[PDB]
Amino acid sequence: ISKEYHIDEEVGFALPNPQENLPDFYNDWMFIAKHLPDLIESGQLRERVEKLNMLSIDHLTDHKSQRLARLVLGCITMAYVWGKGHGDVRKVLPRNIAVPYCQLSKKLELPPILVYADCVLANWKKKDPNKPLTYENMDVLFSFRDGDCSKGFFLVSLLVEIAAASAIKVIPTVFKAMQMQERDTLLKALLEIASCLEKALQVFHQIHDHVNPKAFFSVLRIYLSGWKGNPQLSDGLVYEGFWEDPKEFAGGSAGQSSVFQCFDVLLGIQQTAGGGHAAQFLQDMRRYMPPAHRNFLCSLESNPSVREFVLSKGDAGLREAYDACVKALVSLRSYHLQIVTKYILIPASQQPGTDLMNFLKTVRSTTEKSLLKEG
Amino acid sequence: MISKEYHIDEEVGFALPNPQENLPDFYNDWMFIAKHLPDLIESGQLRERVEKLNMLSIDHLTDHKSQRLARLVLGCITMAYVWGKGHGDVRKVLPRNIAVPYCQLSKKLELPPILVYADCVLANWKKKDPNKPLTYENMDVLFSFRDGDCSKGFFLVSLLVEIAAASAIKVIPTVFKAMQMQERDTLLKALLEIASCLEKALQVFHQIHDHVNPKAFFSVLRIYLSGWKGNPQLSDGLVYEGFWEDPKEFAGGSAGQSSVFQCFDVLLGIQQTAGGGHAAQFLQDMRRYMPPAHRNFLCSLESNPSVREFVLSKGDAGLREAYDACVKALVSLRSYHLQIVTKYILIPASQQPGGTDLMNFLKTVRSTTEKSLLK
Ligand SMILES: CC[C@@H](NC(=O)c1ccc(Cl)cc1)[C@H]1[C@@H]2C[C@@H](Oc3ccnc4ccccc34)C[C@@H]21
Ligand SMILES: CC[C@@H](NC(=O)c1ccc(Cl)cc1)[C@H]1[C@@H]2C[C@@H](Oc3ccnc4ccccc34)C[C@@H]21
């Protein structure tokens, strides 16, 4: 894989060893971002952001410091917009934060809202660098509220991204085997991908130890929410000093994960084909991924179809191995639907989530229908 | 210099070189209807003739050129059938005999089952005399809808603009090689060469006034190019009988489906698809209405390093001037397009007892182009 796609041998689409501290110049951003639970509870978040001077982004020289700054400002933005998460909202992001956040956003080519790539892919650290990438040796950099289970939700997502990284590095082998007409290597490679996505499902299981349904639904979900098709901000958000009209941007989503999409693309499971809402949504989320990763996806599409290759050969072993990859994705979707019932639907029904359920039902359905032989 | 997998011709660029006029005998029934659309629509014979067709297999369309002609054929028939005489009586259902093969062929070519720019411009032409050049006077379209519809003018002037732009497309490898090799003089020359062709392409655009009449365009041709995405006349889309039980929405023909309309923006790092705006949304969506080879090309352009960041980093007035000349030439093309939309859509509409949408789209594209100036 070309290093120009920003994919790591070890952590895959995750930003390897993200930067924790910014330059001292940015101490005022860092303070607020580091103390969102405390500032929100004390009712001083909106006051502190308003007392900020407009800082230059020019001292953010490298990619990682720029990415750290995006996480910092995106979390501050979510805290500023949503407040205590009980309906009192702001519809104007002040210039002192809005301007540099948008400057930095345009430069990195992400929209100025917190995305998956901020709060999962850049939002982590090893505790001891020598010790391996395990939950106990890891931690998130930023959270919204005390008891929000943001560490669990984000790190468990990150660990799935990492798990899937072992499959990602096999992708080159697949197209090379196709180009070379090397059937045995193709078979071996597809089995290895299947094996890696199976492992990734076991990593997904860890969620239950680190996230409870009430804390996620009643708190965390709120702070990840966006302002595209949201009654609370019908027309979107005003980035004072940068854009004159309010702009709409979608909130965080698993559809923003590149591993959530790349294996569908690999296997010719045409998730973005046809006019359907799920397809549209999945394509739209490419623009919420970093450009290099967005580029990885559409360049996978430009390569020849693994599916048509496999369909044409009259080779049961190849078909089995292709199906094993597909089956593994079905399993990941099914497990996700279970997680959506426990963490969204049930909590919702108790008060005096369905779109995500149906979205995932469609994604699972499309995945399952791309099997060559039934699972 | 440009890979053949991207289906770009050196002479005609994104246009299908030397398009096919006649399909196999097996499809004489498709061809009779398509070649006589003016007579069959006016006389109200069109719909019955389509209705009495037998469902032909797409297996006998062997080569890409014949496969593309067949789309041009079925696409026009589909618009005729849907819109009829263009007076408001429409068909919410496309019959299985035509719909099944059109959908099967569409899936095969990775295009949606609706007439697109690549059908009715890039594949809808012939030379009168092969020995004489690619000029309006030596050329003809293959299919029109109605008498007096100016489809010759509208389609061929679009094609000639595509062809004029082809001169610049072949310089794209020079640009990327020059960056990689750190060849400043080559890059300057290359950018100036690109700006020269886009300036030329603007003068080719001026011909539209000689061959196209506002009334005829607005009241006749525009109706046959309309699709069924966000259209009050088919609110749920069209039923493709036999293929889907539910009606699917698809957008009508558009300049945003032209690959040259998009590719130089990408080249020059103008982020027309950035932000969550409507114009950016549309341009991305229209990539899936381009032939997949051309869709891929735009994707590989995106994935290459930024010409804009290169010119900006270098601190070189000459390079900046040569880059700005390319941007200035794109601005002029959008400005000219807007004047045409005023003449051909806005004014006619004012006299009649989504022109504003197309104007706003173009205004957003022009604005974004202007903002990429360096001076
Ligand atoms: C708490 C965990 C949950 N996380 C989120 O939903 C999430 C949502 C918004 C944000 Cl801002 C951050 C995280 C879960 C991760 C891993 C999950 O992986 C996958 C699911 C389904 N299919 C797949 C096919 C291939 C590869 C991975 C897949 C998606 C997502
Ligand atoms: C009647 C002509 C007009 N045609 C159409 O709008 C048209 C619309 C729908 C269909 Cl089904 C067929 C044609 C015009 C062509 C060439 C026009 O080129 C360009 C405009 C603006 N900017 C540009 C920047 C770079 C390169 C080309 C550009 C676009 C479009």
PDB file of C-alpha atoms in Angstrom, chain A residues 77-322:
ATOM      1  CA  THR A  77     -17.523  22.838  19.311  1.00  0.00           C
ATOM      2  CA  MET A  78     -19.759  19.930  20.365  1.00  0.00           C
ATOM      3  CA  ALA A  79     -19.687  21.121  23.990  1.00  0.00           C
ATOM      4  CA  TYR A  80     -20.436  24.712  22.937  1.00  0.00           C
ATOM      5  CA  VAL A  81     -23.331  23.807  20.629  1.00  0.00           C
ATOM      6  CA  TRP A  82     -25.064  21.214  22.870  1.00  0.00           C
ATOM      7  CA  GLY A  83     -24.211  22.645  26.303  1.00  0.00           C
ATOM      8  CA  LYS A  84     -25.552  20.405  29.098  1.00  0.00           C
ATOM      9  CA  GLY A  85     -27.305  18.180  26.513  1.00  0.00           C
ATOM     10  CA  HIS A  86     -30.846  19.007  27.655  1.00  0.00           C
ATOM     11  CA  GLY A  87     -32.125  21.209  24.785  1.00  0.00           C
ATOM     12  CA  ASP A  88     -30.509  24.610  25.497  1.00  0.00           C
ATOM     13  CA  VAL A  89     -28.391  24.994  22.332  1.00  0.00           C
ATOM     14  CA  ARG A  90     -26.177  27.565  20.547  1.00  0.00           C
ATOM     15  CA  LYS A  91     -26.637  28.213  16.805  1.00  0.00           C
ATOM     16  CA  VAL A  92     -23.572  30.473  16.374  1.00  0.00           C
ATOM     17  CA  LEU A  93     -20.032  29.217  16.836  1.00  0.00           C
ATOM     18  CA  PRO A  94     -18.052  32.370  17.834  1.00  0.00           C
ATOM     19  CA  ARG A  95     -15.224  33.575  15.577  1.00  0.00           C
ATOM     20  CA  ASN A  96     -12.484  33.087  18.158  1.00  0.00           C
ATOM     21  CA  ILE A  97     -12.940  29.297  17.745  1.00  0.00           C
ATOM     22  CA  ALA A  98     -14.993  29.067  14.483  1.00  0.00           C
ATOM     23  CA  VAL A  99     -12.438  30.812  12.266  1.00  0.00           C
ATOM     24  CA  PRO A 100      -9.295  28.776  13.197  1.00  0.00           C
ATOM     25  CA  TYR A 101     -11.342  25.543  13.385  1.00  0.00           C
ATOM     26  CA  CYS A 102     -12.570  26.145   9.800  1.00  0.00           C
ATOM     27  CA  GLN A 103      -9.099  27.233   8.621  1.00  0.00           C
ATOM     28  CA  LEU A 104      -7.617  24.054  10.071  1.00  0.00           C
ATOM     29  CA  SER A 105     -10.550  22.006   8.712  1.00  0.00           C
ATOM     30  CA  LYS A 106     -10.232  23.288   5.125  1.00  0.00           C
ATOM     31  CA  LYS A 107      -6.441  22.609   5.247  1.00  0.00           C
ATOM     32  CA  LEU A 108      -6.911  18.958   6.379  1.00  0.00           C
ATOM     33  CA  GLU A 109      -9.908  18.743   3.990  1.00  0.00           C
ATOM     34  CA  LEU A 110     -12.396  17.543   6.658  1.00  0.00           C
ATOM     35  CA  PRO A 111     -15.599  19.406   7.484  1.00  0.00           C
ATOM     36  CA  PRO A 112     -15.586  21.596  10.649  1.00  0.00           C
ATOM     37  CA  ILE A 113     -17.482  19.141  12.839  1.00  0.00           C
ATOM     38  CA  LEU A 114     -16.183  16.332  15.033  1.00  0.00           C
ATOM     39  CA  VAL A 115     -15.956  13.146  12.964  1.00  0.00           C
ATOM     40  CA  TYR A 116     -15.017   9.508  13.579  1.00  0.00           C
ATOM     41  CA  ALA A 117     -11.477  10.314  12.401  1.00  0.00           C
ATOM     42  CA  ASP A 118     -11.133  12.908  15.185  1.00  0.00           C
ATOM     43  CA  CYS A 119     -12.732  11.190  18.173  1.00  0.00           C
ATOM     44  CA  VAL A 120     -11.646   7.605  17.407  1.00  0.00           C
ATOM     45  CA  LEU A 121      -8.697   7.695  15.032  1.00  0.00           C
ATOM     46  CA  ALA A 122      -6.751  10.657  16.551  1.00  0.00           C
ATOM     47  CA  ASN A 123      -8.170  10.434  20.082  1.00  0.00           C
ATOM     48  CA  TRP A 124      -5.799   7.922  21.677  1.00  0.00           C
ATOM     49  CA  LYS A 125      -2.463   7.247  23.406  1.00  0.00           C
ATOM     50  CA  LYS A 126      -0.401   4.298  24.634  1.00  0.00           C
ATOM     51  CA  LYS A 127       0.202   4.493  28.407  1.00  0.00           C
ATOM     52  CA  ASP A 128       3.532   2.641  28.115  1.00  0.00           C
ATOM     53  CA  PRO A 129       4.885   2.845  24.486  1.00  0.00           C
ATOM     54  CA  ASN A 130       6.739  -0.502  24.845  1.00  0.00           C
ATOM     55  CA  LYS A 131       3.668  -2.445  25.996  1.00  0.00           C
ATOM     56  CA  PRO A 132       1.279  -3.554  23.198  1.00  0.00           C
ATOM     57  CA  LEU A 133      -1.980  -2.029  21.860  1.00  0.00           C
ATOM     58  CA  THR A 134      -4.356  -3.428  24.479  1.00  0.00           C
ATOM     59  CA  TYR A 135      -7.271  -1.648  26.234  1.00  0.00           C
ATOM     60  CA  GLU A 136      -5.445  -1.547  29.614  1.00  0.00           C
ATOM     61  CA  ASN A 137      -2.412   0.108  28.020  1.00  0.00           C
ATOM     62  CA  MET A 138      -4.597   2.668  26.162  1.00  0.00           C
ATOM     63  CA  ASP A 139      -6.661   5.757  26.895  1.00  0.00           C
ATOM     64  CA  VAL A 140      -8.630   8.461  25.027  1.00  0.00           C
ATOM     65  CA  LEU A 141      -7.386  12.033  25.057  1.00  0.00           C
ATOM     66  CA  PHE A 142     -10.756  13.810  25.386  1.00  0.00           C
ATOM     67  CA  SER A 143     -14.246  13.314  26.809  1.00  0.00           C
ATOM     68  CA  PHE A 144     -17.483  15.271  27.165  1.00  0.00           C
ATOM     69  CA  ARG A 145     -19.061  14.340  30.503  1.00  0.00           C
ATOM     70  CA  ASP A 146     -18.132  12.346  33.557  1.00  0.00           C
ATOM     71  CA  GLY A 147     -19.672   8.883  33.230  1.00  0.00           C
ATOM     72  CA  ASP A 148     -20.291   9.244  29.463  1.00  0.00           C
ATOM     73  CA  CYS A 149     -18.277   6.048  28.650  1.00  0.00           C
ATOM     74  CA  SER A 150     -16.413   7.940  25.901  1.00  0.00           C
ATOM     75  CA  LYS A 151     -13.189   6.004  26.647  1.00  0.00           C
ATOM     76  CA  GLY A 152     -14.970   2.685  26.071  1.00  0.00           C
ATOM     77  CA  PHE A 153     -16.958   3.749  23.004  1.00  0.00           C
ATOM     78  CA  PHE A 154     -13.982   5.326  21.266  1.00  0.00           C
ATOM     79  CA  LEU A 155     -11.205   2.852  22.274  1.00  0.00           C
ATOM     80  CA  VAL A 156     -13.344  -0.203  21.422  1.00  0.00           C
ATOM     81  CA  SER A 157     -13.960   1.340  17.971  1.00  0.00           C
ATOM     82  CA  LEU A 158     -10.244   2.062  17.673  1.00  0.00           C
ATOM     83  CA  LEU A 159      -9.352  -1.523  18.637  1.00  0.00           C
ATOM     84  CA  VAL A 160     -11.652  -2.823  15.868  1.00  0.00           C
ATOM     85  CA  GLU A 161      -9.880  -0.489  13.387  1.00  0.00           C
ATOM     86  CA  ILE A 162      -6.578  -1.923  14.619  1.00  0.00           C
ATOM     87  CA  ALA A 163      -7.854  -5.530  14.346  1.00  0.00           C
ATOM     88  CA  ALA A 164      -9.020  -4.878  10.777  1.00  0.00           C
ATOM     89  CA  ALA A 165      -5.550  -3.394   9.899  1.00  0.00           C
ATOM     90  CA  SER A 166      -4.222  -6.949   9.522  1.00  0.00           C
ATOM     91  CA  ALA A 167      -6.791  -7.539   6.757  1.00  0.00           C
ATOM     92  CA  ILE A 168      -6.051  -4.164   5.090  1.00  0.00           C
ATOM     93  CA  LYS A 169      -2.390  -4.998   4.390  1.00  0.00           C
ATOM     94  CA  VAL A 170      -3.453  -8.166   2.483  1.00  0.00           C
ATOM     95  CA  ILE A 171      -5.429  -6.085  -0.104  1.00  0.00           C
ATOM     96  CA  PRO A 172      -2.307  -5.523  -2.297  1.00  0.00           C
ATOM     97  CA  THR A 173      -1.779  -9.326  -2.407  1.00  0.00           C
ATOM     98  CA  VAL A 174      -5.374  -9.793  -3.696  1.00  0.00           C
ATOM     99  CA  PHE A 175      -5.061  -7.518  -6.765  1.00  0.00           C
ATOM    100  CA  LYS A 176      -1.517  -8.710  -7.500  1.00  0.00           C
ATOM    101  CA  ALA A 177      -2.733 -12.323  -7.376  1.00  0.00           C
ATOM    102  CA  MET A 178      -5.583 -11.357  -9.750  1.00  0.00           C
ATOM    103  CA  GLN A 179      -3.237  -9.527 -12.147  1.00  0.00           C
ATOM    104  CA  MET A 180      -0.718 -12.429 -12.072  1.00  0.00           C
ATOM    105  CA  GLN A 181      -3.429 -15.140 -12.481  1.00  0.00           C
ATOM    106  CA  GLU A 182      -2.217 -16.775  -9.224  1.00  0.00           C
ATOM    107  CA  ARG A 183      -5.196 -18.747  -7.894  1.00  0.00           C
ATOM    108  CA  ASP A 184      -3.571 -20.279  -4.785  1.00  0.00           C
ATOM    109  CA  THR A 185      -2.286 -16.919  -3.493  1.00  0.00           C
ATOM    110  CA  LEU A 186      -5.687 -15.310  -4.049  1.00  0.00           C
ATOM    111  CA  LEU A 187      -7.318 -18.129  -2.077  1.00  0.00           C
ATOM    112  CA  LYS A 188      -4.750 -17.872   0.762  1.00  0.00           C
ATOM    113  CA  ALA A 189      -5.155 -14.072   0.871  1.00  0.00           C
ATOM    114  CA  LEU A 190      -8.974 -14.162   1.057  1.00  0.00           C
ATOM    115  CA  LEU A 191      -8.813 -16.682   3.886  1.00  0.00           C
ATOM    116  CA  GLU A 192      -6.396 -14.395   5.760  1.00  0.00           C
ATOM    117  CA  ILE A 193      -8.755 -11.418   5.313  1.00  0.00           C
ATOM    118  CA  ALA A 194     -11.673 -13.598   6.488  1.00  0.00           C
ATOM    119  CA  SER A 195      -9.607 -14.634   9.525  1.00  0.00           C
ATOM    120  CA  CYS A 196      -8.771 -10.993  10.348  1.00  0.00           C
ATOM    121  CA  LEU A 197     -12.412  -9.795  10.195  1.00  0.00           C
ATOM    122  CA  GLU A 198     -13.401 -12.738  12.402  1.00  0.00           C
ATOM    123  CA  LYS A 199     -10.790 -11.579  14.958  1.00  0.00           C
ATOM    124  CA  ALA A 200     -12.179  -8.028  14.645  1.00  0.00           C
ATOM    125  CA  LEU A 201     -15.642  -9.300  15.684  1.00  0.00           C
ATOM    126  CA  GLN A 202     -14.103 -10.719  18.888  1.00  0.00           C
ATOM    127  CA  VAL A 203     -12.547  -7.294  19.567  1.00  0.00           C
ATOM    128  CA  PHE A 204     -16.039  -5.707  19.078  1.00  0.00           C
ATOM    129  CA  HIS A 205     -17.244  -7.977  21.959  1.00  0.00           C
ATOM    130  CA  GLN A 206     -15.173  -5.856  24.432  1.00  0.00           C
ATOM    131  CA  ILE A 207     -17.787  -3.029  24.231  1.00  0.00           C
ATOM    132  CA  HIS A 208     -19.946  -4.478  27.015  1.00  0.00           C
ATOM    133  CA  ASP A 209     -17.231  -4.120  29.677  1.00  0.00           C
ATOM    134  CA  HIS A 210     -16.568  -0.452  28.852  1.00  0.00           C
ATOM    135  CA  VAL A 211     -19.968   1.118  27.841  1.00  0.00           C
ATOM    136  CA  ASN A 212     -23.396   1.082  29.568  1.00  0.00           C
ATOM    137  CA  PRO A 213     -26.698   1.844  27.650  1.00  0.00           C
ATOM    138  CA  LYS A 214     -27.981   4.764  29.778  1.00  0.00           C
ATOM    139  CA  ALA A 215     -24.691   6.709  29.731  1.00  0.00           C
ATOM    140  CA  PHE A 216     -24.336   6.247  25.953  1.00  0.00           C
ATOM    141  CA  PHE A 217     -27.932   7.002  24.959  1.00  0.00           C
ATOM    142  CA  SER A 218     -28.812   9.754  27.437  1.00  0.00           C
ATOM    143  CA  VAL A 219     -25.376  11.517  27.269  1.00  0.00           C
ATOM    144  CA  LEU A 220     -22.693  10.466  24.752  1.00  0.00           C
ATOM    145  CA  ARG A 221     -25.011  10.141  21.700  1.00  0.00           C
ATOM    146  CA  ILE A 222     -26.098  13.758  22.340  1.00  0.00           C
ATOM    147  CA  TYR A 223     -22.568  15.206  22.098  1.00  0.00           C
ATOM    148  CA  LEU A 224     -21.783  13.240  18.907  1.00  0.00           C
ATOM    149  CA  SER A 225     -24.986  14.556  17.285  1.00  0.00           C
ATOM    150  CA  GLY A 226     -24.660  16.882  14.299  1.00  0.00           C
ATOM    151  CA  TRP A 227     -26.699  19.537  12.523  1.00  0.00           C
ATOM    152  CA  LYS A 228     -27.901  18.090   9.237  1.00  0.00           C
ATOM    153  CA  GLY A 229     -31.652  17.362   9.322  1.00  0.00           C
ATOM    154  CA  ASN A 230     -31.855  18.123  13.024  1.00  0.00           C
ATOM    155  CA  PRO A 231     -34.954  19.993  14.358  1.00  0.00           C
ATOM    156  CA  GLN A 232     -32.796  21.543  17.125  1.00  0.00           C
ATOM    157  CA  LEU A 233     -30.730  23.320  14.410  1.00  0.00           C
ATOM    158  CA  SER A 234     -33.030  23.253  11.332  1.00  0.00           C
ATOM    159  CA  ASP A 235     -30.756  25.448   9.191  1.00  0.00           C
ATOM    160  CA  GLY A 236     -27.424  24.211  10.678  1.00  0.00           C
ATOM    161  CA  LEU A 237     -24.685  26.165  12.494  1.00  0.00           C
ATOM    162  CA  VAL A 238     -23.154  29.623  11.917  1.00  0.00           C
ATOM    163  CA  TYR A 239     -19.350  29.590  11.779  1.00  0.00           C
ATOM    164  CA  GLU A 240     -19.010  33.298  12.665  1.00  0.00           C
ATOM    165  CA  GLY A 241     -16.176  35.023  10.814  1.00  0.00           C
ATOM    166  CA  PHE A 242     -15.727  32.228   8.234  1.00  0.00           C
ATOM    167  CA  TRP A 243     -19.059  31.517   6.545  1.00  0.00           C
ATOM    168  CA  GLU A 244     -21.931  33.979   6.452  1.00  0.00           C
ATOM    169  CA  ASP A 245     -24.771  31.482   6.063  1.00  0.00           C
ATOM    170  CA  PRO A 246     -25.279  28.563   8.449  1.00  0.00           C
ATOM    171  CA  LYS A 247     -23.835  25.260   7.135  1.00  0.00           C
ATOM    172  CA  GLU A 248     -25.130  21.714   7.774  1.00  0.00           C
ATOM    173  CA  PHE A 249     -22.817  18.820   8.661  1.00  0.00           C
ATOM    174  CA  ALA A 250     -23.722  15.282   9.770  1.00  0.00           C
ATOM    175  CA  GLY A 251     -22.688  14.009  13.182  1.00  0.00           C
ATOM    176  CA  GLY A 252     -20.381  11.111  13.973  1.00  0.00           C
ATOM    177  CA  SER A 253     -21.179   7.686  12.536  1.00  0.00           C
ATOM    178  CA  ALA A 254     -19.791   4.194  11.947  1.00  0.00           C
ATOM    179  CA  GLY A 255     -20.362   4.911   8.220  1.00  0.00           C
ATOM    180  CA  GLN A 256     -17.442   7.344   8.546  1.00  0.00           C
ATOM    181  CA  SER A 257     -15.148   4.395   9.327  1.00  0.00           C
ATOM    182  CA  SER A 258     -13.013   3.443   6.333  1.00  0.00           C
ATOM    183  CA  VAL A 259     -12.882  -0.246   7.403  1.00  0.00           C
ATOM    184  CA  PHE A 260     -16.675  -0.147   7.643  1.00  0.00           C
ATOM    185  CA  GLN A 261     -16.641   0.455   3.853  1.00  0.00           C
ATOM    186  CA  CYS A 262     -13.334  -0.693   2.304  1.00  0.00           C
ATOM    187  CA  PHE A 263     -13.982  -4.457   2.377  1.00  0.00           C
ATOM    188  CA  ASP A 264     -17.400  -3.940   0.767  1.00  0.00           C
ATOM    189  CA  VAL A 265     -15.548  -2.129  -2.003  1.00  0.00           C
ATOM    190  CA  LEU A 266     -12.855  -4.815  -2.115  1.00  0.00           C
ATOM    191  CA  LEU A 267     -15.438  -7.556  -2.539  1.00  0.00           C
ATOM    192  CA  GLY A 268     -17.715  -5.709  -5.023  1.00  0.00           C
ATOM    193  CA  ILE A 269     -20.587  -5.531  -2.508  1.00  0.00           C
ATOM    194  CA  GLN A 270     -21.792  -2.349  -4.194  1.00  0.00           C
ATOM    195  CA  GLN A 271     -22.986  -0.520  -1.022  1.00  0.00           C
ATOM    196  CA  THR A 272     -22.983   2.873  -2.829  1.00  0.00           C
ATOM    197  CA  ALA A 273     -24.742   1.566  -6.014  1.00  0.00           C
ATOM    198  CA  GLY A 274     -28.368   2.580  -6.723  1.00  0.00           C
ATOM    199  CA  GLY A 275     -30.263   5.600  -5.357  1.00  0.00           C
ATOM    200  CA  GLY A 276     -31.055   4.216  -1.855  1.00  0.00           C
ATOM    201  CA  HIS A 277     -30.619   6.247   1.324  1.00  0.00           C
ATOM    202  CA  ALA A 278     -28.003   3.842   2.761  1.00  0.00           C
ATOM    203  CA  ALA A 279     -25.911   4.045  -0.415  1.00  0.00           C
ATOM    204  CA  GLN A 280     -26.175   7.812  -0.472  1.00  0.00           C
ATOM    205  CA  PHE A 281     -25.277   8.071   3.203  1.00  0.00           C
ATOM    206  CA  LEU A 282     -22.269   5.780   2.799  1.00  0.00           C
ATOM    207  CA  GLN A 283     -20.962   7.833  -0.152  1.00  0.00           C
ATOM    208  CA  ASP A 284     -21.622  11.110   1.693  1.00  0.00           C
ATOM    209  CA  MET A 285     -19.565   9.880   4.670  1.00  0.00           C
ATOM    210  CA  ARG A 286     -16.491   9.526   2.410  1.00  0.00           C
ATOM    211  CA  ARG A 287     -16.250  13.309   2.549  1.00  0.00           C
ATOM    212  CA  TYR A 288     -16.080  13.019   6.379  1.00  0.00           C
ATOM    213  CA  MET A 289     -13.025  10.746   6.132  1.00  0.00           C
ATOM    214  CA  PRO A 290      -9.518  12.141   5.699  1.00  0.00           C
ATOM    215  CA  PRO A 291      -8.739  12.702   1.988  1.00  0.00           C
ATOM    216  CA  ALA A 292      -6.051  10.002   1.748  1.00  0.00           C
ATOM    217  CA  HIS A 293      -8.523   7.417   3.112  1.00  0.00           C
ATOM    218  CA  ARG A 294     -11.307   8.714   0.875  1.00  0.00           C
ATOM    219  CA  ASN A 295      -8.806   8.301  -1.972  1.00  0.00           C
ATOM    220  CA  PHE A 296      -8.018   4.754  -0.883  1.00  0.00           C
ATOM    221  CA  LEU A 297     -11.684   3.796  -1.241  1.00  0.00           C
ATOM    222  CA  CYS A 298     -12.335   5.152  -4.737  1.00  0.00           C
ATOM    223  CA  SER A 299      -8.983   3.829  -5.973  1.00  0.00           C
ATOM    224  CA  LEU A 300     -10.077   0.355  -4.746  1.00  0.00           C
ATOM    225  CA  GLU A 301     -13.124   0.785  -7.017  1.00  0.00           C
ATOM    226  CA  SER A 302     -10.902   1.629  -9.976  1.00  0.00           C
ATOM    227  CA  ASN A 303      -9.160  -1.740  -9.630  1.00  0.00           C
ATOM    228  CA  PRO A 304     -10.762  -4.839 -11.261  1.00  0.00           C
ATOM    229  CA  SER A 305     -13.621  -6.599  -9.430  1.00  0.00           C
ATOM    230  CA  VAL A 306     -12.589  -9.368  -7.014  1.00  0.00           C
ATOM    231  CA  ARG A 307     -16.189 -10.665  -7.286  1.00  0.00           C
ATOM    232  CA  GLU A 308     -16.313 -11.012 -11.100  1.00  0.00           C
ATOM    233  CA  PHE A 309     -12.881 -12.611 -11.007  1.00  0.00           C
ATOM    234  CA  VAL A 310     -14.170 -15.168  -8.438  1.00  0.00           C
ATOM    235  CA  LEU A 311     -17.542 -15.677 -10.182  1.00  0.00           C
ATOM    236  CA  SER A 312     -15.901 -16.476 -13.517  1.00  0.00           C
ATOM    237  CA  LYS A 313     -13.412 -19.208 -12.442  1.00  0.00           C
ATOM    238  CA  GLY A 314     -15.670 -22.222 -11.555  1.00  0.00           C
ATOM    239  CA  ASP A 315     -13.516 -22.770  -8.476  1.00  0.00           C
ATOM    240  CA  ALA A 316     -15.416 -23.803  -5.325  1.00  0.00           C
ATOM    241  CA  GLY A 317     -12.427 -23.202  -2.992  1.00  0.00           C
ATOM    242  CA  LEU A 318     -12.064 -19.626  -4.238  1.00  0.00           C
ATOM    243  CA  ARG A 319     -15.819 -19.094  -3.876  1.00  0.00           C
ATOM    244  CA  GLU A 320     -15.750 -20.504  -0.325  1.00  0.00           C
ATOM    245  CA  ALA A 321     -12.874 -18.162   0.584  1.00  0.00           C
ATOM    246  CA  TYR A 322     -14.683 -15.158  -0.951  1.00  0.00           C
TER     247      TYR A 322
END
